[PDB]
Amino acid sequence: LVIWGTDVNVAACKENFQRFLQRFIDYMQRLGEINVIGEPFLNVNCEHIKSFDKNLYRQLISYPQEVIPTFDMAVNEIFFDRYPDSILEHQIQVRPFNALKTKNMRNLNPEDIDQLITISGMVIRTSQLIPEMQEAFFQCQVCAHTTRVEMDRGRIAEPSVCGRCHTTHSMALIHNRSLFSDKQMIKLQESPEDMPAGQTPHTVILFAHNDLVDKVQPGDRVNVTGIYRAVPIRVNPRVSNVKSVYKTHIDVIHY
Amino acid sequence: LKDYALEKEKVKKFLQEFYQDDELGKKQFKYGNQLVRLAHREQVALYVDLDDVAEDDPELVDSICENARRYAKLFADAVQELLPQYKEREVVNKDVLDVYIEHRLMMEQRSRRSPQNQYPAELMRRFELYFQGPSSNKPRVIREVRADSVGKLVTVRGIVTRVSEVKPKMVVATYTCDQCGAETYQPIQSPTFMPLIMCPSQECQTNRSGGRLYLQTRGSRFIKFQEMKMQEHSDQVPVGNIPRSITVLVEGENTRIAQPGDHVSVTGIFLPILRTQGLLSETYLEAHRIVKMNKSEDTREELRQIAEEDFYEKLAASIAPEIYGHEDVKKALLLLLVGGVDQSPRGMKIRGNINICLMGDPGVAKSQLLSYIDRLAPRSQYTTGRGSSGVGLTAAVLRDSVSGELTLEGGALVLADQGVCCIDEFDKMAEADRTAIHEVMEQQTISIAKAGILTTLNARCSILAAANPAYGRYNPRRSLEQNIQLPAALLSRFDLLWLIQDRPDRDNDLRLAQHITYVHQHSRQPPSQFEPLDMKLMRRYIAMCREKQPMVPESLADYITAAYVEMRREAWASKDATYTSARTLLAILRLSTALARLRMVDVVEKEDVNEAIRLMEMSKDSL
């Protein structure tokens, strides 16, 4: 019937939320202005639907790396069929907006390895735009023919595995479909709501990867709902040894 | 050296059919409820009190003590094997780990003992097990833990001196390949591990293919981890020794309990760590329980004559006898020995903050007594003024060789927790250090936007200051604010200022030469026919007096208030160098702290008014 290894239903919303979309209408002007303006990053709010059924809400906080992309295709399918003469140059990514205020922001247990969290703090330091290296292509020397092997969709090509022949960045840099991303080093500052001043405040390294960079000014209010991540820190570049402690870092998904 | 099946059966029976009646006088299956909760993911940590085990199996307790890791793993496996029979429904998917675990079990059963075809025991736990030290084992001193006790469950006490922040540590690493479709598990025990390259999947075993694998953090097990350094209690360290530091690692629910400067009790397994000319290894302590008090939640006149007699004549007379007199100055030390530990629970933390200052180190060699205060005073730790560089109190980031990734360390103030803090060579301290003391006067509001310091120090000790005279003795002709270059306002913040002028009093000088011989000359040190006693007991006599917790009189305040009116007018009208202000008010109330507790009358209080005054009179006109 279906493979349950990824915990993914038929769009997870076809029988649950897509019919709600044609049921929720029964403010036209407010939802329709999305089409006219052509502004990406849909900014849905905290799901009050969760009070009736948790399962709908619980599947967008368990495996968000494999669920948020799913919402993107669902939005486009209706939008293309309804308004084919719209701005198709900008792909639209659904992003939660003002999600559930996580209780005990300081007390983040490592149990929530990959779950949405909401931090509330300030911005201290910001870094200049930094690109990030990803999979590239090589240069053949046989009959001058470009052979596609990994072009076919369906495979998972994670980066950092094939960092060889960087000379490709001199000539074929544009043609490799390797548009570098943007990252901004950001250091949040916990604001414990006028705590009696007991323990020290926890710093969290914020490293937004999306193209939303710089829209956050230093020293402001923080309503950043993000996705927790953990990566292993190399002990020394000279060796391959890896220590059994991981650094916290949070990806921003928010307007 | 025993059949492990029999021991597993014994622990199974012990867990299944033991109970108590202490729970509201009702049998509630003490371990049974905890097992039920563990099976239902209602509880994360399981504690096994060895005392209950000893109630019917002392030999098991001794065997456990002789070897801790092996019995720990055996108990963990037994609990894991006892859980499934208590499952009642479908998992409510508490977190991602439970989701992955239930899919793994469902898929394994879907394909309905091979050595390499089973999940590692640590991967499918979702529970943590720890041992609480049995009461039989007396606490041990850190110096006495040597290589001979490696692998033995021990308990040691100390003070937390260097605690890092909570970070995740990896137990089982999850690997997936793009050709196998299975899951590869690599349990990690050492702090270092090597990422895999070639997948060990059975499918690739046949094909000998490339099998390039990618590490993932999805289904990996994570547990909490901390690094803390603990140092010996100063009360039991010998005078001819120094305290030693031993490393303690705490994991799981047991974390986030220690704070710097707090007395903790630690129990764990003493194990060596390799770091990848012989076989070298370090030592650490994998804590299992950190324990607070349980009982804290809520005298005949024919035997001795102690409380009727003033402590100013009795307590002073056997403390610091080598001091060359100056007993009047010593009286304040008695106030300092009392401190402000006994405080009302209303946020008045300034009661224990007594910032006493002394000017003049060469004076009658009083620099010697400063060290003596820390050693004899209990619940106090030795402190140095300028014994090291500036890195000793603040925090910085430098290179490391053994360990330490941006770890946080405490300073001198944190070193002595709610006790007596001694600082020497005040002049030699830089202005940055001088502000740091001044920050304590501002009632502990330490907020710093600098990268290396963002801490809030728990300054609850008492700050004792000794000031050298600046390149010369006090000048009678020159008044303050002109002869001393440092602003008086900085010194004004200090509550008490003391200086001793070495006057040519020939009669007094005669006494010292005779007095200096007596020390270590005979065994009659308390000359007032006091029995020699054991030196240990002298401190214990003080402790029972503090436990009485008497009550000061409230009505006594109004009578003293009338006295203050005259005191203000005469002090101001003099217009001399010595002057007072509203800060005197703090001193007066602080005076009653030690004075009124001593008198256990509770009927009429009159003498305290003159006694409080008499303390000010010596302070008055001290110049």
Coordinates of N, CA and C in Angstrom, one line a residue, chain A residues 2-7 55 58 61-67 106-115 124-125 155-161 187 189 196-203 228-233 235 239-248, chain B residues 41 44 92-97 99-100 102-103 106 110 126 165-170 173 178-179 188-195 214-225 253 256 258-259 276 403-405 408 444 448-449 451 454-456 458:
Chain A
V2 N 1.7 1.4 1.0 CA 2.6 2.6 1.2 C 3.8 2.2 2.0
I3 N 4.9 2.8 1.8 CA 6.1 2.6 2.6 C 6.1 3.6 3.8
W4 N 6.1 3.0 5.0 CA 6.1 3.8 6.2 C 7.4 4.2 6.8
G5 N 8.5 3.9 6.1 CA 9.8 4.2 6.6 C 10.1 5.7 6.8
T6 N 9.4 6.5 6.0 CA 9.6 8.0 6.1 C 8.5 8.7 6.8
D7 N 7.5 8.0 7.3 CA 6.3 8.6 8.0 C 5.6 9.6 7.2
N55 N -2.4 14.8 15.7 CA -1.6 14.1 14.7 C -1.3 15.1 13.5
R58 N 1.4 17.2 15.0 CA 2.6 16.5 15.4 C 3.5 16.1 14.3
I61 N 6.3 18.8 13.4 CA 7.4 19.1 14.3 C 8.2 17.9 14.6
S62 N 7.9 16.7 14.1 CA 8.7 15.5 14.3 C 9.8 15.5 13.3
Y63 N 9.5 15.5 12.0 CA 10.5 15.4 10.9 C 10.4 16.6 9.9
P64 N 10.6 17.8 10.4 CA 10.4 19.0 9.6 C 11.3 19.1 8.4
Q65 N 12.4 18.4 8.4 CA 13.3 18.5 7.2 C 12.7 17.7 6.1
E66 N 11.8 16.7 6.3 CA 11.2 16.0 5.3 C 9.7 16.3 5.1
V67 N 9.2 17.3 5.9 CA 7.8 17.7 5.8 C 7.6 19.1 5.2
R106 N 15.8 27.9 27.9 CA 17.1 27.6 28.4 C 17.3 26.1 28.5
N107 N 16.3 25.4 28.9 CA 16.4 24.0 29.2 C 16.2 23.1 28.0
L108 N 16.8 23.5 26.9 CA 16.7 22.6 25.7 C 17.4 21.3 25.9
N109 N 16.7 20.2 26.0 CA 17.3 18.9 26.1 C 17.8 18.5 24.8
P110 N 18.8 17.6 24.7 CA 19.2 17.1 23.4 C 18.2 16.1 22.9
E111 N 17.1 15.8 23.6 CA 16.2 14.9 23.0 C 15.5 15.4 21.7
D112 N 15.3 16.7 21.7 CA 14.8 17.4 20.5 C 15.9 17.7 19.5
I113 N 16.5 16.6 19.0 CA 17.6 16.7 18.0 C 17.1 17.5 16.8
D114 N 16.0 17.2 16.2 CA 15.4 17.8 15.0 C 14.0 18.1 15.3
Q115 N 13.7 19.2 15.9 CA 12.3 19.7 16.2 C 12.3 21.2 16.1
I124 N 23.6 40.1 18.9 CA 24.8 40.7 19.3 C 25.7 41.0 18.1
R125 N 26.1 40.0 17.4 CA 27.1 40.2 16.3 C 26.6 39.6 15.0
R155 N 18.0 10.4 -6.5 CA 19.1 10.1 -5.6 C 19.4 11.3 -4.6
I156 N 20.1 10.9 -3.6 CA 20.4 11.9 -2.5 C 21.9 12.2 -2.5
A157 N 22.3 13.4 -3.0 CA 23.7 13.7 -3.1 C 24.1 14.7 -2.0
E158 N 24.4 14.3 -0.8 CA 24.8 15.2 0.3 C 26.1 15.8 0.0
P159 N 26.3 17.1 0.4 CA 27.6 17.8 0.2 C 28.7 17.3 1.0
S160 N 29.9 17.9 0.8 CA 31.1 17.7 1.6 C 31.7 16.4 1.3
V161 N 31.2 15.6 0.3 CA 31.8 14.3 0.0 C 32.7 14.3 -1.1
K187 N 24.7 35.5 16.9 CA 24.8 35.1 18.3 C 23.6 35.7 19.1
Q189 N 21.0 36.1 22.4 CA 21.3 36.4 23.8 C 20.0 36.2 24.6
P196 N 15.7 36.6 38.8 CA 16.5 37.0 40.0 C 18.0 37.0 39.8
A197 N 18.5 36.6 38.6 CA 19.9 36.6 38.3 C 20.6 35.4 39.1
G198 N 20.3 34.2 38.7 CA 20.9 33.0 39.3 C 22.0 32.6 38.3
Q199 N 21.8 31.5 37.6 CA 22.8 31.0 36.7 C 23.1 31.9 35.6
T200 N 24.2 31.6 34.9 CA 24.6 32.4 33.7 C 23.7 32.2 32.5
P201 N 23.6 33.2 31.6 CA 22.7 33.0 30.4 C 23.4 32.2 29.3
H202 N 22.6 31.5 28.6 CA 23.1 30.6 27.6 C 23.1 31.3 26.2
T203 N 24.3 31.1 25.6 CA 24.4 31.6 24.2 C 24.1 30.5 23.2
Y228 N 16.5 22.7 15.1 CA 17.7 22.4 15.8 C 18.5 21.4 15.0
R229 N 19.8 21.5 15.1 CA 20.7 20.7 14.3 C 21.9 20.4 15.2
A230 N 22.6 19.3 14.8 CA 23.9 18.9 15.5 C 24.8 18.3 14.5
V231 N 26.1 18.8 14.5 CA 27.1 18.2 13.6 C 28.3 17.9 14.4
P232 N 29.1 16.9 14.0 CA 30.3 16.6 14.7 C 31.5 17.5 14.4
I233 N 32.2 17.9 15.5 CA 33.3 18.8 15.3 C 34.6 18.0 15.1
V235 N 38.3 17.0 15.4 CA 39.3 17.2 16.5 C 40.4 18.0 15.9
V239 N 43.8 15.2 11.2 CA 43.4 13.8 11.4 C 41.9 13.7 11.0
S240 N 41.3 12.5 11.2 CA 39.9 12.3 11.0 C 39.2 12.0 12.3
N241 N 39.9 12.0 13.4 CA 39.2 11.7 14.7 C 38.1 12.8 15.0
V242 N 37.1 12.3 15.6 CA 35.9 13.1 15.9 C 35.5 12.9 17.4
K243 N 35.3 14.1 18.1 CA 35.1 14.0 19.5 C 33.6 13.7 19.8
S244 N 33.3 13.1 20.9 CA 32.0 12.7 21.3 C 31.2 13.8 22.0
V245 N 31.4 15.1 21.5 CA 30.6 16.2 21.9 C 30.2 17.0 20.6
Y246 N 28.9 17.4 20.6 CA 28.4 18.1 19.4 C 28.0 19.5 19.8
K247 N 28.2 20.5 18.8 CA 27.9 21.8 19.0 C 26.4 22.1 18.6
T248 N 25.6 22.8 19.5 CA 24.3 23.2 19.1 C 24.4 24.3 18.0
Chain B
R41 N 7.2 5.2 29.5 CA 7.9 6.4 29.2 C 7.4 7.6 30.0
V44 N 12.3 8.9 33.3 CA 13.5 8.8 32.5 C 14.7 8.1 33.3
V92 N 2.8 6.5 22.5 CA 2.1 7.8 22.2 C 3.2 8.7 21.6
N93 N 4.3 8.2 21.2 CA 5.3 8.9 20.4 C 5.8 10.1 21.2
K94 N 6.4 9.9 22.3 CA 6.9 11.0 23.1 C 7.9 11.9 22.4
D95 N 8.8 11.2 21.7 CA 9.9 12.0 21.0 C 10.3 11.2 19.7
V96 N 11.2 11.7 19.0 CA 11.7 11.0 17.8 C 12.3 9.7 18.1
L97 N 13.0 9.6 19.2 CA 13.6 8.3 19.5 C 12.6 7.2 19.7
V99 N 9.7 7.0 18.3 CA 9.2 6.7 16.9 C 10.1 5.8 16.2
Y100 N 11.4 6.1 16.2 CA 12.4 5.2 15.5 C 12.4 3.9 16.1
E102 N 10.0 2.2 17.7 CA 8.9 1.4 17.4 C 8.9 1.0 16.0
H103 N 9.3 1.8 15.1 CA 9.5 1.3 13.7 C 10.5 0.2 13.6
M106 N 8.9 -3.0 14.8 CA 7.9 -3.4 13.9 C 8.5 -4.0 12.7
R110 N 8.5 -7.8 11.4 CA 7.9 -8.1 10.1 C 8.6 -9.2 9.4
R126 N 16.2 4.0 26.2 CA 15.3 5.0 26.6 C 15.1 5.1 28.1
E165 N 29.1 23.9 30.5 CA 27.7 24.0 30.2 C 27.2 22.7 29.6
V166 N 25.9 22.4 29.7 CA 25.3 21.2 29.2 C 25.4 21.1 27.7
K167 N 26.0 19.9 27.3 CA 26.1 19.6 25.9 C 25.7 18.2 25.6
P168 N 25.4 17.9 24.4 CA 25.0 16.5 24.0 C 26.2 15.7 23.7
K169 N 26.2 14.4 24.2 CA 27.2 13.4 24.0 C 26.6 12.2 23.3
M170 N 27.3 11.6 22.4 CA 26.7 10.5 21.5 C 27.0 9.1 22.1
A173 N 26.0 5.9 17.3 CA 26.0 6.6 16.0 C 25.3 5.9 14.9
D178 N 23.6 4.0 0.8 CA 22.7 4.3 -0.3 C 22.4 3.0 -1.1
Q179 N 23.0 1.9 -0.7 CA 22.9 0.7 -1.5 C 22.3 -0.4 -0.6
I188 N 29.6 4.1 20.9 CA 30.8 5.0 21.2 C 30.9 5.1 22.7
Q189 N 32.0 4.7 23.2 CA 32.3 4.8 24.7 C 33.4 5.8 25.0
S190 N 34.5 5.8 24.3 CA 35.6 6.7 24.5 C 35.1 8.1 24.1
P191 N 35.7 9.2 24.6 CA 35.4 10.5 24.1 C 35.8 10.8 22.7
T192 N 36.6 9.9 22.1 CA 36.9 10.0 20.6 C 36.5 8.8 19.9
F193 N 36.1 8.9 18.7 CA 35.7 7.8 17.8 C 36.0 8.1 16.4
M194 N 36.1 7.1 15.6 CA 36.5 7.2 14.2 C 35.3 7.0 13.3
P195 N 34.9 7.9 12.4 CA 33.7 7.7 11.6 C 34.0 6.5 10.6
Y214 N 27.1 7.5 4.8 CA 27.0 8.9 5.3 C 26.4 8.9 6.7
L215 N 27.2 9.5 7.6 CA 26.7 9.6 9.0 C 25.5 10.5 9.1
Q216 N 24.6 10.1 10.0 CA 23.4 10.8 10.2 C 23.1 11.0 11.7
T217 N 22.4 12.1 12.1 CA 22.1 12.4 13.5 C 20.6 12.2 13.8
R218 N 19.8 11.6 12.9 CA 18.4 11.4 13.1 C 18.1 10.5 14.2
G219 N 18.3 9.2 14.0 CA 18.0 8.2 15.0 C 19.1 7.9 16.0
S220 N 20.2 8.6 16.0 CA 21.2 8.4 17.0 C 20.7 8.6 18.4
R221 N 21.2 7.9 19.3 CA 20.9 8.2 20.7 C 21.8 9.2 21.2
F222 N 21.3 10.2 21.9 CA 22.0 11.2 22.6 C 21.7 11.2 24.1
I223 N 22.7 11.5 24.9 CA 22.5 11.7 26.3 C 23.3 12.9 26.8
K224 N 22.8 13.5 27.9 CA 23.4 14.7 28.4 C 24.8 14.4 29.0
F225 N 25.7 15.5 29.0 CA 27.0 15.3 29.5 C 27.5 16.6 30.1
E253 N 19.9 12.5 33.6 CA 19.0 13.3 34.5 C 19.8 13.9 35.6
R256 N 22.8 19.2 35.5 CA 22.1 20.5 35.8 C 21.7 20.6 37.3
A258 N 24.6 20.5 40.0 CA 25.7 21.1 40.6 C 25.8 22.6 40.2
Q259 N 26.1 23.5 41.1 CA 26.5 24.8 40.8 C 27.8 25.1 41.4
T276 N 44.3 7.7 23.5 CA 44.7 7.1 22.3 C 46.3 7.3 22.1
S403 N 42.1 18.6 27.8 CA 40.6 18.8 27.5 C 40.3 20.3 27.8
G404 N 39.0 20.6 27.7 CA 38.5 21.9 28.0 C 38.1 22.7 26.7
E405 N 36.9 22.8 26.4 CA 36.4 23.5 25.2 C 35.6 24.7 25.7
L408 N 34.2 27.1 31.8 CA 34.0 28.3 32.7 C 34.7 27.9 34.0
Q444 N 25.6 42.7 43.7 CA 25.6 41.5 42.7 C 24.7 41.7 41.5
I448 N 27.5 41.8 31.9 CA 28.6 42.3 31.1 C 28.4 41.8 29.6
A449 N 28.6 42.7 28.7 CA 28.3 42.5 27.3 C 29.6 42.0 26.6
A451 N 32.6 39.3 25.6 CA 32.4 37.9 25.1 C 32.8 36.9 26.2
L454 N 30.1 36.8 31.1 CA 28.7 37.1 31.2 C 28.1 36.5 32.4
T455 N 28.9 36.2 33.4 CA 28.5 35.5 34.6 C 27.9 36.4 35.7
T456 N 27.2 35.7 36.6 CA 26.7 36.4 37.8 C 27.3 35.7 39.0
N458 N 28.1 34.4 42.7 CA 27.4 34.3 43.9 C 28.3 34.8 45.1

